[PDB]
Amino acid sequence: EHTITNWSGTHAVRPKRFFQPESVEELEKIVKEAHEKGQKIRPVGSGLSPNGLAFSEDGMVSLALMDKVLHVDKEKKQVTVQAGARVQQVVDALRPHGLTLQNFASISEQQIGGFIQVGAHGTGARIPPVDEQVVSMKLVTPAKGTIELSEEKDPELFRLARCGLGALGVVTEVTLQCVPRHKLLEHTFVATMKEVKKNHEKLLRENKHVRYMWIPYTDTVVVVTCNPLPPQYSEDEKLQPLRNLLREAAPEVSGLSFTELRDALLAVDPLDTEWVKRVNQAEAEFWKRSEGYRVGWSDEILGFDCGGQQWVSEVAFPAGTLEKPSAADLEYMEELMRLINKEGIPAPAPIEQRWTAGSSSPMSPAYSPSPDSVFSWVGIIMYLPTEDEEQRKAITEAFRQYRKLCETRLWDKYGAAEHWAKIEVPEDPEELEALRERLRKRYPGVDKFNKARRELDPKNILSNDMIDSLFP
Ligand SMILES: Cc1cc2nc3c(=O)[nH]c(=O)nc-3n(C[C@H](O)[C@H](O)[C@H](O)COP(=O)(O)OP(=O)(O)OC[C@H]3O[C@@H](n4cnc5c(N)ncnc54)[C@H](O)[C@@H]3O)c2cc1C
């Protein structure tokens, strides 16, 4: 009944103790007493991380009841919000103030604490991950009680703690640098690899938001651009290629959304590469029939409800600077498509490619000493289309092998770092040792992160098995 499960049902936990304080004073008392008794209190937001980063069998603390907007600074365009607020609640609260977030990370149901603590991101070559939106914060620490951090109050600890994986304190309050509320024009169109390469450098720098959806085993890339705003196909015709392909396989089809159609297609034979080729070809035809323009407020256009169950792996890797472009982002995709074909991986769509500016947070996968660094983020996916336990098991193993080939063939070469909400802990002790050392190479600040953990959480009450495994 009080099992906590993630979005895709890949991780679940029943914590022995579950705390949901209604005030800072109540939280301060929970942290002091947990510290005195040496009892685990892993901070949890919405609990939606694909890897169950927030999960603990021992103890979890939720700030969901502490979700108020405390202050809007009209002149500085800043909001101070309790960390238990969902992104959606902040968006709704900012609407009458004419403000919005600089960027979004797909789902509006995540909490502000969970959003910043993993270094979540959207797309936009000139826009950093969301940990860089943080101007100041308050943190309840086991060692020092409630502390305030900002560029003016212990900047070094601030830049660690704001992207701190819940390991440095319970965030109570965050001040975010907002931008004016604004409409975006979203353009969806298809291109080949060749057309993408031709326009790529200029497209990234001349469009506020650019995202590619690569369709494996096709030469279709779906390009989506969004910019501030100063033959039409029916839904039935857009879905026709997927509906026709599903009728061809041994079986109301007409009731299914696009995402339910892709799931029902993949469910036929999810690990058969020749079948996945046909599913991906049908999906490419859907996207060709989906070219066009939408207009909406930035939160509506940049936000997605998603909905499927899936395995995801996303890596950040450097792709030069605004002034000195790098080809590493297109070269990565070239090698990844070659790897999928060469190895016969039943890779469904999309392989999602996004861009951020660098972050000054040392634990950001997109950490850079340069503010105008550009990072490419590449997400691979396999869907879990049914609750069939044997099929889920087979796809889980296929995804592990798919990710492992990217890790061994590409990640070190490109300096790729895994998203903190998507990274899985290996069980093999040699692979775990190897990952711990890889994290020290990918993250210059790992030793300083552990130093801050010893300083703020000496009895290690904020860390779960995952944190202990990655950062011994
Ligand atoms: C369908 C889906 C789509 C996604 N799309 C994107 C995307 O586009 N871009 C992207 O970057 N990410 C994306 N994510 C990942 C998501 O942004 C992260 O998993 C995020 O951490 C979820 O927020 P949450 O409130 O569920 O956090 P949780 O999973 O509950 O917690 C995440 C981390 O925050 C810590 N934490 C939470 N609250 C506090 C607090 N008050 N104080 C201290 N630590 C705290 C936890 O200990 C944990 O380390 C997606 C996830 C899903 C399921």
Author numbering: 9 to 238, 248 to 268, 286 to 506
Q: What does the publication say?
A:
In photosynthetic organisms, L-ascorbic acid is produced in the Smirnoff-Wheeler pathway by the multi-step conversion of D-mannose-6-phosphate to L-galactono-1,4-lactone, the substrate for the final biosynthetic enzyme, L-galactono-1,4-lactone dehydrogenase (GalDH) [EC 1.3.2.3]9,15. GULO, ALO, and GalDH are generally named aldonolactone oxidoreductases and form a group of sequence-related flavoenzymes belonging to the vanillyl-alcohol oxidase family. They oxidize the C2 carbon atom of their monosaccharide substrates and thereby generate the characteristic, redox-reactive C2-C3 double bond of L-ascorbic acid and its analogs. GalDH is a dehydrogenase that reacts poorly with oxygen.
To elucidate the structural features of GalDH and how it interacts with its substrate, we determined the crystal structures of the viridiplantae ancestor without (1.9 Å resolution) and with L-galactono-1,4-lactone (2.1 Å resolution). As a member of the vanillyl-alcohol oxidase family, the structure of vGalDH can be divided into flavin- (residues 1-189, 452-511) and substrate-binding (190-451) domains. The FAD is embedded in the flavin domain with the isoalloxazine ring in the classical position at the domain interface where an open cleft forms the active site on the si side of the flavin. For all three substrates, we observed only marginal oxidase activities (< 0.2 s−1). With the GalDH crystal structure at hand, we noticed that Ala113 is in direct contact with the N5-C4a locus of the flavin at the edge of the cofactor ring.
